[PDB]
Design a protein around this ligand. Structure first.
Ligand SMILES: [Zn+2]
Length: 258
């Protein structure tokens, strides 16, 4: 009976195994755009993905992760609110059963169809497992997806999903360029928060881009054909793998733009 996204083990149940679910800096949150403060001391983001080395794509039973070689400074995030260098380890998405829901963050209570998380860890802590135990251990770049035109840079991901339909399946996934998932603008909101799946550790500096990317209805429909279950177990479509917004508590969201 472990955590997931069904009726009996969904986000409202996670606090029984992970009491930090009711903590002081949980994610995601609603971004109230009129209450976020411009922070003119906020530097531009530096997204350095030209030497990124993707390795593999994995269905882990809650989402799929595209994993990267993070044993060297090959794909790094710097700047913005960050001190130091954060290395890309994986990206994944959250999405809905319908186009009207799927994002974890919301913007003035608006839900997007999906949300991309590019997860990075602070190299001063040496590895990901040490970084998640530190208040500044991770930096996650969040990008909203809306349905409209296709995103050409996503299609290589879409096309391998058939090979990782069920939990525990992986496939080689080299030479994928994550720069093809970024919008034109790097304007962002930032706040301190948490992982949005268990163990829900409060180790994340969130950087949420204001501009969404647009994917086609056919692209998101292929996400919804994945399965939460393992092969030869009853089929349960992988949809609605998003945590809803959590209370902001004693936090201020800052904006890089006015
Ligand atoms: Zn995520």
């Amino acid at each position: 009976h472990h955590w997931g996204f069904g009726k009996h083990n969904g986000p409202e149940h996670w606090h029984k195994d992970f009491p930090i679910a009711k903590g002081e800096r949980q994610s995601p949150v609603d971004i109230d755009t009129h209450t976020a403060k411009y922070d003119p001391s906020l530097k531009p983001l530096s997204v350095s993905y030209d030497q990124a080395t993707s390795l593999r794509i994995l269905n882990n039973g809650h989402a799929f992760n595209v994993e990267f070689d993070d044993s060297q400074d090959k794909a790094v995030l710097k700047g913005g609110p960050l001190d130091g260098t954060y290395r890309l380890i994986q990206f994944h998405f959250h999405w809905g059963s319908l186009d009207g829901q799927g994002s974890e963050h919301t913007v003035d209570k608006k839900k997007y169809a999906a949300e991309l998380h590019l997860v990075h860890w602070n190299t001063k802590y040496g590895d990901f497992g040490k970084a998640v135990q530190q208040p500044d251990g991770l930096a996650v770049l969040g990008i909203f997806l809306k349905v409209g035109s296709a995103k050409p840079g996503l299609q290589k991901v879409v096309d391998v999903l058939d090979s990782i339909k069920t939990k525990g399946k992986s496939a080689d996934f080299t030479n994928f360029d994550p720069r093809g998932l970024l919008p034109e603008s790097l304007d962002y909101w930032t706040y301190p928060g948490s992982l949005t799946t268990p163990p829900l550790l409060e180790c994340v500096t969130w950087i949420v881009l204001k501009e969404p990317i647009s994917v086609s209805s056919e692209q998101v429909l292929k996400f919804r054909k994945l399965n939460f279950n393992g092969e030869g177990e009853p089929e349960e479509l992988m949809v609605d793998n998003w945590r809803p917004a959590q209370p902001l508590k004693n936090r201020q969201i800052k904006a890089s733009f006015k």
